[PDB]
Design a protein around this ligand. Structure first.
Ligand SMILES: [Hg+2]
Ligand SMILES: [Hg+2]
Ligand SMILES: [Hg+2]
Ligand SMILES: [Hg+2]
Ligand SMILES: [Hg+2]
Ligand SMILES: [Hg+2]
Ligand SMILES: [Hg+2]
Length: 1185
């Protein structure tokens, strides 16, 4: 894939003349900061030149014993004063400059973002309604804060950091050439091999990356299927059969993960070799040029570093480019919306605004097709008039085009052909806001906004008084119930507040329209979702609302329409018939046909996690030794680098300056080789140690997950997705807290430990300065990581309130356009952004300082060392070689632990990722399905008995469900459970399945308490038939055979089960009869046919109990009767408990139980409970209507 982007010059629109100034000044700062370090290398060379000019004089030949001390040392004391005044001068200039760099760029970005948010949100509120039809709203809402966040990255400080790095790239290669061009051109001849070597691996590391996500996608698809279907898994006890499927597809991503683990460390050691190799080749050649008195030692050390600084400056500007390019990419999708102009402008002020509107409506030859499918036409040549004050009712079948009428009259769409007119004037010639202000809509499903009732009404009109709210509420028949609410009119409604009934919400929606006082009223299926009781009060409110207004209603439920003035019957976008109720009933057309049919913070320890990888201890031993060696190469380099410069800066005969240097020069390749080996071995032992640990933990987890009982899967935290996540990536991230953490610690110890030792003996005074400053500079890098993340939470949390407003407006956009309150949410959006704006303008002031005080404390400490270290050479207390042997042992070694710790996986994220694993493993359930003990008798009777069971769902222990529920079920007969809502009938199936235990009471099977039986054997002789049957992506034969696990199951056994389920006849005509793959790829079976499979699945087990829980939850009229044939067949000679909602099934049952509030109110046969004239008699009386 390749996504488009914006031109550079476009993207920086919305940048006023002040914003254009900050970026320019911010650059000139960034340029200075970029060159600031090259000058430190240039001075560093001139520093060693002063030391080298005397380093060999005073040693070989002794002119005087103490009159020569002053001679050479008073020369250095005057030369080293300037080099020290120079070093502090940079850190002072950095402190100023580094502030300007970050401050001015983040400021110019902030002023632009604030304009973008408002310009982008207003752009969305201005779009057409056909525009919302095509686009996915979910991405759009995230696009308001994700793409906007993506632009903010690539126009803030990240540009300042780019011009800083490029000012070093040119600033570095400049001083290299101008102080000595031969040695640089050597290095620039090998660096293409390094830029080549780096890119080739990133192509192979991205190769072994994307090969991995599609490798676990096979396993993770099994994880997502099971943990969503866990109720069927536990019910049929396939908790070991799903483990093998998940495991057999789990070794692929292990062997593949090693090919990354090897290659990932080759790419390091290969590129790390080429550093040490390019080190020798530049030092071997750089030393040959000082022997001949062409260069000094200062010239080599400047040019060699200043190239590597300027060369490594590329890699420091790579992500800052990608952020700027990602910012252009995200800015394209945004700026498209701002510059997109609609034909139906809800903000324009063009058309007329006619007063004293009578409401004469007309439709003239309307042809319309929704923008999703132009090819199909909904309306074709539709003509219709509506006289002022009259009510017209539109009726028809499906695909008729009724709801289009409401949507064309608000002008949410423009008709292709024809003309919609109000009072003889075309609708397209009047102003849109005034049009929708003179119209009130009453949609099918009523919407309420997360505010008070008063604000919900004030969205009808912002300037309404509280007296007018009371009147409009009274007219809507909503007053008396509002006064019964706790906080009267200030009661908080919406998603956030108390839930109101459906009939109550729609009456509020009326009051919004009534406040507008419209001349036209539109009702789009206003009472479809409401029941018979709530509809009656609303119709009185609507009939009141219609008085003196022209009205068009999209009417279902035809009885409400009989008193209407005129009816219109639709067939294929055309009105076929029109007249009064009596006329169309007489016509015996379309309308007559319709009327007559009606009438997360756990604490895991480091030692616990490490024990998980204990079964591969030999891999850990090698990685420790190997980690020590690579940790030893860093202080080794400090010697070999110092021993080189020690030759030409302490004194020696030119007879030995060749073999010493060439030795030390080729000792870098020795370090370079050993680097390549230790990386090739670090990722071969700790690498496999991590990829084994992933596979073994994903198995242990998914094993332990299925062990858990149902109350665990009932939790809100343990959702099927959050468990697949926990099983997918969290299971693998543990390895960053086992062997990787030992590779770190042994490398950090072997480096900084042995580096501390050496520097202490070679110079005990200077180290106490540096090892006192290293803690200071390391802390500063941490506090920036803190305040960068602690501020990331603060700003991103202040923005959700702004985002809640937007989310409320996008998710209900069709509403707000009808209320014409686009401007309101715009202001509400802007008012919410006033807080993060004024906060972010001081954020740049902060991060300007924290960036300056980090860089300045480094350059000042660079001067505090080479000032104090110079004082140690003047007093003859240490050699300049020992300075570099101290400095490049502590500093370059203290930098090494960061380059290590920053390369390894996130240890904090790894430990918490591991603590979640251990809980999921070490958790044993109240009901161990994997257990083996239990009575498990040879008694095949089937006497069920509940005795006073008391149960509360542990997810909600406050509510009760069952209180003293007792009931028996004799062998072979049927028991039916019925009741109102929240009675507890479905709990019986789950307690006999033993998904949960009861708090008190007991459940017996064949006179034996089920808590003593084996759980698998209990569920074995129970045949569950769930409401919505879960079918797995597999063939018919395997899905049915899943019922009875651990059986040979041959061809002969399969067909008998499908026969008795009444699918054999339907199957035999299907393509490839019983081998037909079922799932998303294969044939889609109807809801009734799926249930017969779940019945067939239960029949193969041959259980002596059958639980039927709300089966037949569908309207498949033909397939319905087929299911009941199969259901009656299964119950004939088995103990049966039925969760009854259909009144036809229960009449022939042997016994019935009416439950209410966990108590049996009455029980008996059908005829007895009918003659009881109690609760059960009330239920049968309802169907007589
Ligand atoms: Hg910033
Ligand atoms: Hg319709
Ligand atoms: Hg290693
Ligand atoms: Hg130093
Ligand atoms: Hg119920
Ligand atoms: Hg399957
Ligand atoms: Hg039965």
């Amino acid at each position: 894939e390749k996504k488009p982007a914006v031109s550079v010059l476009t993207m920086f629109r919305y940048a006023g003349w002040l914003d254009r100034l900050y970026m320019l000044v911010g650059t000139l700062a960034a340029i200075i900061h970029g060159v600031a370090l090259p000058l430190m290398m240039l001075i560093f060379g001139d520093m060693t030149d002063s030391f080298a000019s005397v380093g060999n004089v005073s040693k070989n030949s002794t002119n005087m014993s103490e009159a020569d001390k002053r001679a050479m040392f008073a020369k250095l004391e005057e030369e080293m004063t300037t080099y020290a005044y120079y070093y502090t001068g940079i850190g002072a200039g950095v402190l100023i400059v580094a502030y300007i760099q970050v401050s001015f760029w983040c400021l110019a970005a902030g002023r632009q973002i604030h304009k973008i948010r408002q310009k982008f949100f207003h752009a969305i509120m201005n779009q057409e309604i056909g525009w919302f039809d095509v686009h996915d709203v979910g991405e759009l809402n995230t696009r308001l804060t994700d793409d906007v966040s993506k632009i903010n990255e690539g126009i803030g400080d990240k540009i300042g950091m780019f011009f800083q790095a490029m000012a070093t790239f040119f600033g570095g290669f400049i001083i290299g050439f101008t102080r000595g061009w031969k040695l640089t051109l050597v290095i620039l001849a090998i660096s293409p091999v390094l830029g080549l070597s780096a890119g080739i691996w990133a192509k192979i590391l991205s190769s072994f990356t994307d090969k991995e996500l599609h490798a676990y996608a096979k396993a993770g698809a099994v994880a997502e299927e099971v943990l969503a279907a866990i109720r069927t898994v536990i019910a049929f006890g396939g908790q070991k059969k799903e483990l093998e499927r998940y495991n057999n597809n789990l070794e692929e991503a292990k062997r593949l993960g090693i090919k990354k683990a090897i290659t990932a460390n080759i790419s390091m050691g290969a590129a790390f070799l080429l550093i040490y190799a390019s080190y020798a080749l530049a030092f071997w050649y750089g030393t040959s040029l000082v022997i001949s008195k062409e260069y000094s030692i200062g010239q080599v050390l400047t040019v060699f570093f200043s190239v590597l600084i300027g060369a490594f400056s590329v890699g420091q500007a790579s992500p800052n480019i990608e952020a700027f390019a990602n910012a252009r990419g995200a800015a394209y999708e945004v700026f498209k919306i701002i510059d997109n102009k609609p034909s139906i402008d809800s903000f324009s002020k063009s058309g007329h605004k006619p007063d004293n509107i009578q409401g004469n409506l007309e439709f003239k030859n309307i042809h319309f097709s929704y923008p999703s499918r132009k090819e199909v036409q909904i309306l074709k040549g539709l003509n219709l008039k509506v006289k002022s004050g009259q009510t017209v009712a539109l009726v028809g079948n499906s695909g008729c085009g009724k709801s289009t009428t409401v949507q064309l009259m608000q002008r949410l769409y423009d008709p292709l052909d024809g003309m919609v007119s109000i009072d003889g004037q075309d609708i397209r010639t009047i102003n849109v806001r005034y049009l929708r202000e003179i119209i009130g809509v009453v949609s099918q499903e009523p919407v309420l906004f997360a505010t008070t009732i008063a604000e919900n009404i004030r969205y009808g009109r912002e300037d309404v008084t509280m007296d007018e709210i009371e009147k409009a509420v009274k007219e809507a028949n909503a007053y008396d119930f509002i006064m019964k609410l706790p906080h009267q009119f200030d009661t908080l409604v919406g998603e956030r507040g108390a839930q109101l009934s459906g009939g109550q919400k729609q009456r509020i929606a009326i009051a919004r329209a009534l406040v507008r006082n419209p001349k036209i009223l539109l009702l789009d299926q206003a009472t479809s979702a409401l029941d018979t009781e709530s509809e009656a009060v609303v119709q009185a409110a609507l009939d009141k609302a219609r008085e003196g207004r022209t009205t068009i209603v999209i009417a279902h439920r035809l009885s409400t329409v009989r008193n209407a003035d005129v009816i219109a019957g639709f067939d294929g976008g055309v009105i076929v018939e029109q007249g009064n109720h009596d006329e169309l009933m007489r016509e015996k057309g379309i309308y007559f046909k319709l009327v007559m049919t009606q009438t997360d913070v756990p604490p895991a320890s480091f030692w616990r996690i490490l024990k998980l990888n204990s079964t591969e201890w030999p891999y850990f031993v090698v990685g420790i030794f190997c980690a020590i060696i690579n940790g030893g190469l860093q202080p080794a380099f400090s010697v070999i680098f110092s021993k080189v410069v020690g030759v030409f800066t302490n004194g020696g005969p030119p007879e030995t300056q060749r073999q010493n240097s060439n030795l030390f020069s080729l000792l870098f390749l020795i370090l370079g080789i050993i680097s390549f080996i230790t990386f090739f071995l670090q990722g071969f032992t700790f690498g496999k140690a991590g990829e084994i640990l992933t596979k073994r933990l994903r198995y242990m987890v998914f094993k332990s997950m299925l062990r858990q009982d149902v109350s665990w899967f009932d939790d809100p935290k343990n959702t099927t997705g959050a468990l697949t996540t926990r099983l997918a990536n969290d299971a693998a991230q543990v390895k960053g807290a086992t062997g990787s953490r030992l590779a770190v610690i042994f490398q950090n110890i072997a480096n900084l430990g042995t580096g501390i030792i050496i520097s202490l003996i070679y110079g005990w005074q200077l180290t106490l300065l540096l090892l006192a400053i290293v803690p200071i500079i390391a802390i500063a890098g941490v506090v920036e990581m803190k305040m960068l993340s602690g501020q990331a939470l603060k700003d991103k949390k202040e923005l959700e309130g702004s985002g809640k407003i937007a989310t409320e407006a996008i998710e209900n956009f069709r509403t707000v356009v009808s209320l014409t309150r686009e401007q309101k949410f715009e202001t509400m959006y802007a008012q919410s952004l006033q807080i993060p704006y004024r906060n972010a303008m001081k954020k740049a002031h902060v991060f300007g300082i924290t960036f300056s005080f980090t860089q300045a404390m480094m350059y000042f400490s660079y001067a505090a060392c080479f000032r104090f270290g110079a004082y140690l050479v003047t007093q003859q207390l240490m050699t300049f070689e020992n300075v570099l042997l101290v400095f490049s042992a502590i500093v370059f070694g203290a930098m090494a632990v960061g380059q290590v710790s920053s390369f390894a996986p996130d240890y904090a994220k790894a430990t918490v990722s591991a603590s979640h694993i251990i809980r999921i493993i070490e958790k044993t359930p109240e009901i161990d399905s994997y257990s083996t003990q239990g009575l498990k008798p040879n008694m095949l009777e089937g006497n069920v008995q509940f005795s006073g069971v008391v149960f509360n769902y542990p997810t909600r222990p406050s509510i009760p469900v069952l209180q003293g529920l007792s009931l028996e079920v004799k062998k072979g007969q049927t028991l039916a459970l019925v009741g109102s809502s929240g009675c507890g009938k479905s709990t019986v199936v789950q307690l006999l399945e033993r998904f949960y235990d009861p708090m008190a009471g007991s459940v017996f099977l064949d006179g034996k308490e089920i808590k003593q039986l084996n759980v698998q054997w209990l569920r074995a002789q129970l045949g569950i038939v769930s409401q919505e049957p879960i079918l797995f992506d597999c063939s018919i034969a395997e899905n049915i055979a899943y019922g009875d696990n651990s059986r040979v199951v041959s061809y002969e056994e399969i067909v008998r089960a499908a026969k008795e389920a009444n699918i054999h006849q339907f199957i035999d005509s299907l393509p490839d009869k019983y081998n037909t793959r079922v799932g998303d790829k294969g044939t889609q079976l109807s809801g009734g046919q799926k249930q017969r499979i779940a019945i067939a699945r239960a029949l193969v087990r041959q259980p002596h109990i059958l639980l039927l829980d709300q089966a037949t939850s569908a309207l498949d009229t033909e397939s319905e009767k087929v299911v009941q044939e199969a259901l009656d067949k299964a119950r004939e000679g088995r103990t049966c408990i039925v969760i009854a909602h259909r009144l036809s099934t229960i009449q022939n049952a042997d016994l019935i139980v009416v439950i209410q509030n966990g108590k049996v109110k009455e029980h008996g046969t059908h005829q007895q409970l009918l003659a009881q004239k109690g609760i059960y008699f009330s239920m049968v009386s309802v169907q007589a209507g």
